[PDB]
Design an enzyme around this catalytic site. Structure first.
Site, PDB file in Angstrom:
ATOM      1  N   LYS A 162       0.807  -1.214   0.000  1.00  0.00           N
ATOM      2  CA  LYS A 162       0.000   0.000   0.000  1.00  0.00           C
ATOM      3  C   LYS A 162       0.847   1.274   0.000  1.00  0.00           C
ATOM      4  CE  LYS A 162      -1.822  -0.534   4.060  1.00  0.00           C
ATOM      5  NZ  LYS A 162      -2.613  -0.433   5.302  1.00  0.00           N
ATOM      6  N   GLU A 188       1.515  10.391   6.211  1.00  0.00           N
ATOM      7  CA  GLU A 188       2.521   9.403   5.861  1.00  0.00           C
ATOM      8  C   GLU A 188       3.836   9.753   6.543  1.00  0.00           C
ATOM      9  OE1 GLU A 188       2.904   5.693   4.022  1.00  0.00           O
ATOM     10  OE2 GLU A 188       1.174   7.034   4.133  1.00  0.00           O
ATOM     11  N   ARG A 189       4.675   8.738   6.721  1.00  0.00           N
ATOM     12  CA  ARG A 189       5.992   8.956   7.304  1.00  0.00           C
ATOM     13  C   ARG A 189       6.833   9.829   6.379  1.00  0.00           C
ATOM     14  NH1 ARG A 189       7.407   4.772   9.302  1.00  0.00           N
ATOM     15  NH2 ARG A 189       5.464   3.587   8.978  1.00  0.00           N
TER      16      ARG A 189
HETATM   17  N1  LIG Z   1       7.338  -6.651  -3.984  1.00  0.00           N
HETATM   18  C1  LIG Z   1       7.952  -6.651  -2.785  1.00  0.00           C
HETATM   19  N2  LIG Z   1       9.111  -7.308  -2.608  1.00  0.00           N
HETATM   20  C2  LIG Z   1       9.739  -7.331  -1.422  1.00  0.00           C
HETATM   21  N3  LIG Z   1       9.277  -6.715  -0.325  1.00  0.00           N
HETATM   22  C3  LIG Z   1       8.120  -6.024  -0.363  1.00  0.00           C
HETATM   23  C4  LIG Z   1       7.373  -5.952  -1.623  1.00  0.00           C
HETATM   24  N4  LIG Z   1       6.278  -5.218  -1.385  1.00  0.00           N
HETATM   25  C5  LIG Z   1       6.323  -4.848  -0.080  1.00  0.00           C
HETATM   26  N5  LIG Z   1       7.419  -5.335   0.528  1.00  0.00           N
HETATM   27  C6  LIG Z   1       7.800  -5.120   1.937  1.00  0.00           C
HETATM   28  O1  LIG Z   1       6.622  -4.841   2.684  1.00  0.00           O
HETATM   29  C7  LIG Z   1       6.611  -3.488   3.139  1.00  0.00           C
HETATM   30  C8  LIG Z   1       5.246  -2.863   2.875  1.00  0.00           C
HETATM   31  O2  LIG Z   1       5.359  -1.497   2.486  1.00  0.00           O
HETATM   32  P1  LIG Z   1       5.232  -0.350   3.601  1.00  0.00           P
HETATM   33  O3  LIG Z   1       5.762   0.934   3.023  1.00  0.00           O
HETATM   34  O4  LIG Z   1       5.782  -0.923   4.875  1.00  0.00           O
HETATM   35  O5  LIG Z   1       3.650  -0.194   3.823  1.00  0.00           O
HETATM   36  P2  LIG Z   1       3.037   0.867   4.865  1.00  0.00           P
HETATM   37  O6  LIG Z   1       3.316   2.212   4.240  1.00  0.00           O
HETATM   38  O7  LIG Z   1       1.576   0.497   4.935  1.00  0.00           O
HETATM   39  O8  LIG Z   1       3.787   0.613   6.147  1.00  0.00           O
HETATM   40  C9  LIG Z   1       7.735  -2.764   2.426  1.00  0.00           C
HETATM   41  O9  LIG Z   1       8.439  -1.921   3.338  1.00  0.00           O
HETATM   42  C10 LIG Z   1       8.643  -3.863   1.930  1.00  0.00           C
HETATM   43  O10 LIG Z   1       9.741  -4.022   2.826  1.00  0.00           O
END
Ligand SMILES: Nc1ncnc2c1ncn2[C@@H]1O[C@H](COP(=O)(O)OP(=O)(O)O)[C@@H](O)[C@H]1O
Ligand SMILES: Nc1ncnc2c1ncn2[C@@H]1O[C@H](COP(=O)(O)OP(=O)(O)OP(=O)(O)O)[C@@H](O)[C@H]1O
Lengths: 480, 179, 68, 233
Positions: A162, A188-189
């Protein structure tokens, strides 16, 4: 205006100011407080009136920090409901909720300022043309198509996706869309906002050389702002997008990140404001405020505001009020699941829960609809056999149902995607794959024609031909 | 009711059971004119000031203006309890409670120009007949809002309103829209 | 009204000036944890006030008449 | 001349006292409320000033039952927090919160006393002693070994060994640690109170012949005596 205020009480971010009786501002009226700073005399902190208490004082949430404000400080009401500068000048700059530049470039011009809290567009003028959208993602182009010029929701747990999905979606579309995009960092951060600004200015979207050319116009009311700011930076993004849809006659693509902050900041201010607490802890007017944001995003015969809000499900409480009210507004919702992320299948989009009202057949294409139905049914059969598999062993079920289980594994791994912006997490380059290619892949996967490939050969793969190549790579690496 | 209305009703019951009613009303008018003018209200509020000093200056301001004894005990009880910060609202609602008990009802007539005393007494006849009050008191307010005549704001507090005024043309244009 | 009461008015303004000091006020209530001081219409939210016995404190609640 | 005030408002075991406007007691300053609770006159309802309500009124919670207290009595403040007797005269007597012995055998000597409310020990004067101790139980000596010189809790629901471990650990290490143990049961089934006191005078730690040679100082704030007591046992 000139109506001095004399702020009476300052209880946290909510400050109420005792105006004279005859000259009282209306609701949602900006209140610039002529107050001192920590060091030095001049400082203008902004406040919007939230309600009129009736002892000649009105309650106003603070857009800047509430520290440094004196009981008795002079404050004037603008008479204008927190105008925000929009037009050709808002292209390329990171904007506060106040309507200021945060990128320390030259200040914007106030030629075409617009009110931030305006009435909703009337139903008499609503453009409803149902047209599918090709984002680039295998699953959410196939399993849950997006409605061009319509709201889209990236629901999910805390950190399942997301935001990397929002980054890849903007990386894909913001070049293609002739109309500009208005990214809103609603709570958002900040470091992800920094990453997105750098990625935009490196991907030619911002075009730092010619700042007045950019196809993007950011607003940041990011995580470290007073609860007033996160309550209205979404409305700032909406005001920029509504200008670009009312006047410039171009279809715009606003990305709001973490729209749940637009409700949680409302909670933190509503607690102090005097409004009674609702269910699990949010504000009483959760639904009407959420609608006041979401309804202004509509294709209105002058353009089309396609929008992808990265709704935050509080600890994957998919029944909580904050996502429960946004599911009603969001057309092509997409529930990302921590369950399908803990096993590493990224993106963590749920094949079942993520559903769209663009998966009607006459709208999306008959063969595409049939493939989506078969994929969702196979995944539902797998989710129903998860209990038998986990307890009674993989063998204790049928030998056709075992084919359906292996096919569901193949499918739910094939709908993984190497993003261009998620290469730093994967370590492997990204593959952008179209809609027809993923349909042609799923046809051969669930038609039983290629049930021989190993399960890992369908993991993190762009297209079915790349999966076939990875099967050869893996069969050579097995013996070598 | 409200706490201020309760205290006002107490003072009105005292003005009843002791034959000093109209003197009590005049003394309450004097007392609200006193407890305006923010310095003295802030003095009787702001509980850091010692209660002895507060009640002593209260005794002095009683013996200066020469209030009735019972209303002096009333404001003294207001100071004794911690509900003195309501005294302006209490003295304000005393007009309501005194008039309701005595049987007089206030009628606010708003006219573009000063209304003559004979026609004002005729309006008093009308308000007295429609409400049923003994000595109806008409406090007039010259307002530039209207155009020709008068509005009557008789009733409990503003509630009932009859008027031949700018409301005439207002209703004319508003129901002239009729959409 | 308050015409001949000029001496009484001088008394009340004297007592006010005795109790109404700039950036200074009493502690109305000092509970376990917080203390509810009165006055201090000069301070801003988060201003470290001193209690004259050796214990500083921050002001997180600027209510109308009492600063928490 | 400790300035006395009149008790005004009583809400269960929490009583609000009105003092003269000049001098109000400090926080946690004990108010030994005088008065009469029977045909006689025992003035034993001591209270501790929790919070200043302002306008010379203080909420004080009573370390005993508030029955027999009329609105308008006379209470005095000691000036110092609630003092309990300590020292050699303390070892070997079932104590209450107030500091009076309940075993009605020896009237204690309150010359060597201390207030119950003290500041925390400063960070400089702690121990670098991280020594393991042997309790005498397989499980709590193997899996989660206890720590000498440290607070060692043993959580648990009702009806699951939570007090038999305390009693057995007393039995295992009471005489071994020559330091004088101080059982401070706060909210204890006072039947277990008599059981433990009898087990002490059976195991020879507390001595029915010699009070000084008892090397244990029981304090009982047992499950009664409204929560003014159980908050300070
Ligand atoms: N395609 C992908 N491959 C590897 N890691 C992923 C992928 N998509 C998401 N992630 C991991 O999951 C996390 C989800 O995104 P994030 O920015 O943490 O969401 P939110 O903003 O809701 O916290 C990412 O930080 C990443 O480390
Ligand atoms: N070694 C053992 N042998 C037999 N029964 C035992 C043993 N250890 C514990 N019990 C049982 O545990 C119960 C004690 O309950 P528990 O320790 O929960 O009371 P408690 O709440 O700790 O008491 P207190 O409130 O005094 O601390 C006894 O009824 C006893 O039957």
């Amino acid at each position: 205006k000139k109506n001095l205020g004399r702020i009476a009480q300052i209880i946290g971010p909510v400050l109420d100011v005792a105006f004279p009786p005859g000259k009282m501002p209306n609701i949602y009226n900006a209140l610039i407080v002529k107050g001192r700073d920590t060091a030095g005399q001049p400082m203008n902190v902004t406040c919007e009136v939230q309600q009129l208490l009736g002892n000649n004082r009105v309650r106003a949430v603070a857009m800047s920090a509430t520290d440094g404000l004196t009981r008795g400080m002079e404050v004037i009401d603008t008479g204008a409901p927190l105008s925000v500068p929009v037009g050709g000048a808002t292209l390329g700059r990171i904007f506060n909720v106040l309507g200021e530049p945060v990128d320390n470039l030259g200040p914007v011009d106030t030629r075409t300022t617009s009110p931030i809290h305006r009435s909703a567009p009337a139903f008499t003028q609503l453009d409803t043309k149902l047209s599918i959208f090709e984002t680039g993602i295998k699953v959410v182009d196939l399993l849950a198509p997006y409605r061009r010029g319509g709201k889209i929701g990236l629901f999910g747990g805390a950190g399942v996706g997301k935001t990397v999905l929002i980054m890849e979606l903007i990386n894909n579309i913001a070049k293609a869309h002739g109309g500009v995009s208005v990214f809103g960092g609603v709570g958002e951060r900040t470091r992800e906002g920094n990453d997105l600004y750098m990625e935009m200015k490196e991907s030619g979207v911002i075009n730092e050389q010619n700042i007045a050319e950019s196809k993007v116009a950011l607003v940041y009311g990011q995580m470290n702002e007073p609860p007033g700011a996160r309550m209205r930076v979404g409305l700032t993004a909406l005001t920029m997008a509504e200008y670009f849809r009312d006047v410039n006659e171009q279809d715009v693509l606003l990305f709001i990140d973490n729209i749940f902050r637009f409700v949680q900041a409302g909670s933190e201010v509503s607690a102090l404001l005097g409004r009674m607490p609702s269910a699990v802890g949010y504000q009483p007017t959760l639904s009407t405020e959420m609608g006041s944001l979401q309804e202004r995003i509509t294709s209105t015969k002058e353009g089309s505001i396609t929008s992808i809000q990265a709704v935050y499900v509080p600890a994957d409480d998919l029944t909580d009020p904050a996502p429960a009210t946004t599911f009603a507004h969001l057309d092509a919702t997409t529930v990302l699941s921590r369950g399908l992320a803990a096993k590493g299948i990224y993106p963590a989009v749920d094949p079942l829960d993520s559903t769209s009202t663009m998966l009607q057949p006459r709208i999306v294409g008959e063969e595409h609809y049939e493939i989506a139905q078969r994929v969702k049914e196979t995944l539902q059969r797998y989710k129903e056999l998860q209990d038998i598999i986990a307890i009674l062993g993989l063998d204790e079920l049928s030998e056709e149902d075992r084919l359906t289980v292996a096919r569901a594994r193949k499918i739910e791994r094939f709908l993984s995607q190497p993003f261009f912006v998620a290469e730093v997490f994967t370590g492997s380059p990204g593959k952008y794959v179209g809609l027809a290619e993923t349909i042609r892949g799923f046809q051969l996967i669930l038609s039983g024609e290629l049930d021989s490939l190993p399960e890992q050969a369908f993991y993190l793969v762009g297209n079915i031909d790349e999966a076939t190549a990875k099967a050869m790579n893996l069969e050579m690496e097995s013996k070598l | 009711d409200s706490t201020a209305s309760r205290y006002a009703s107490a003072l009105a019951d005292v003005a009843d059971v002791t034959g000093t009613l109209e003197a009590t009303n005049s003394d309450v008018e004097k007392l609200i004119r006193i407890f305006s003018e923010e310095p003295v209200y802030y003095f009787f509020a702001n509980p850091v000031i010692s209660i002895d000093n507060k009640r002593s200056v209260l005794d002095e301001i009683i013996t200066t203006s020469g209030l009735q004894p019972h209303t002096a005990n009333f404001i003294n009880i207001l100071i004794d309890s911690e509900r003195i910060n309501l005294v302006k609202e209490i003295l304000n609602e005393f007009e309501d409670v005194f008039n309701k008990i005595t049987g007089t009802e206030v009628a606010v007539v708003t006219s573009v120009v000063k209304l003559e005393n004979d026609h004002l007494a005729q309006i008093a006849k009308g308000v007295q007949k429609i409400t049923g009050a003994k000595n109806v008191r008409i406090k007039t307010v010259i307002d530039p809002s209207l155009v020709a005549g008068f509005t009557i704001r008789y009733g409990n507090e503003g509630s009932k309103l009859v008027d031949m005024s700018v409301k005439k043309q207002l209703e004319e244009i508003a129901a002239q829209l009729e959409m | 009204a308050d015409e001949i009461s000029k001496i009484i008015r001088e008394r009340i303004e004297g007592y006010n000036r005795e109790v109404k000091v700039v950036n200074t006020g009493t502690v109305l209530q000092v509970g376990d944890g917080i203390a509810r001081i009165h006055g201090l219409d000069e301070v801003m939210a988060g201003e470290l006030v001193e209690f004259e016995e050796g214990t500083i404190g921050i002001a997180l609640n600027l209510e109308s008449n009492n600063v928490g």
